[PDB]
Amino acid sequence: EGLNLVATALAVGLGAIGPGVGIGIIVSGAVQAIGRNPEIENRVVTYMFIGIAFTEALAIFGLVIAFLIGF
Amino acid sequence: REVMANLTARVVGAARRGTLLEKRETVKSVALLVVTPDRGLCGSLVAN
């Protein structure tokens, strides 16, 4: 049947729930940290980016399944 | 005196070391305070 289509939506759907919240928390914490201490700005951003990518590493993993399920 | 010691030790970053405590570079204008007796006869204290 078309049950693979549910798997197509579930991977991208449930996959984006976690990272969707996670990306929001990371940048919000960085922006507050930049606002309180502007001179550590160049350093915290590097920490933000090296971790914010780890969050979508699972989201891309969901998208990888989202196309593997299709074909 | 100790509150200054306790607080200023915590605040060490030059970026946050602004406002009154900011040790400005290239000093250009200096103001000074003098206190003197309202009435004379004090001796050499006023002259000193």
Tell me how long chain B is: 48
Whether A11 contacts A62, CB under 8 Å: yes
Whether A19 contacts A55, CB under 8 Å: yes
Token code pair at residue A55: 């969050």
Cα–Cα distance measured from residue A47 to residue A54, given in angstroms and rounded to the nearest whole number = 11
Instruction: Kindly state the DSSP code that residue B46 receives in the 8-state scheme.
Output: T
**Tokens 């400005």 -> residue:** B24
Please judge whether A37 and B15 are an interchain contact, meaning their C-beta atoms are less than 8 angstroms apart.
yes
Whether A57 contacts A15, CB under 8 Å: no
Pairs of CB atoms within 8 A across A/B: 8
Assign 3-class secondary structure to B3-39. HHHHHHHHCCCCCCCCHHHCCCCCCCCCCCCCCCCCC
* 3-class secondary-structure state, position B41: coil
Smallest Cα distance from A29 to chain B, Å: 19
Helix (H) or strand (E) holding A64: helix A41-68
Q: Which residues in chain B have their CB less than 8 angstroms from residue A40's CB?
A: 15
Q: Which residues in chain B have their CB less than 8 angstroms from residue A38's CB?
A: 15
* Helix orientation angle between A41-68 and A3-36, rounded to the nearest 10 degrees: 180
SS3 content of chain A, % helix, strand, coil (to 5): 90, 0, 10
**Tokens 């914490």 -> residue:** A29
Helix (H) or strand (E) holding A52: helix A41-68
**Resolution of the model in angstroms:** 2.9
**∠ at Cα A14 (A31, A58), nearest 5°?**
60
The number of C-alpha atoms within 13 Å of A21 and in the hemisphere containing its C-beta is 4
Q: Which residues in chain A have their CB less than 8 angstroms from residue B14's CB?
A: 39
Sign, Cα dihedral of B15, B18, B21, B25: positive
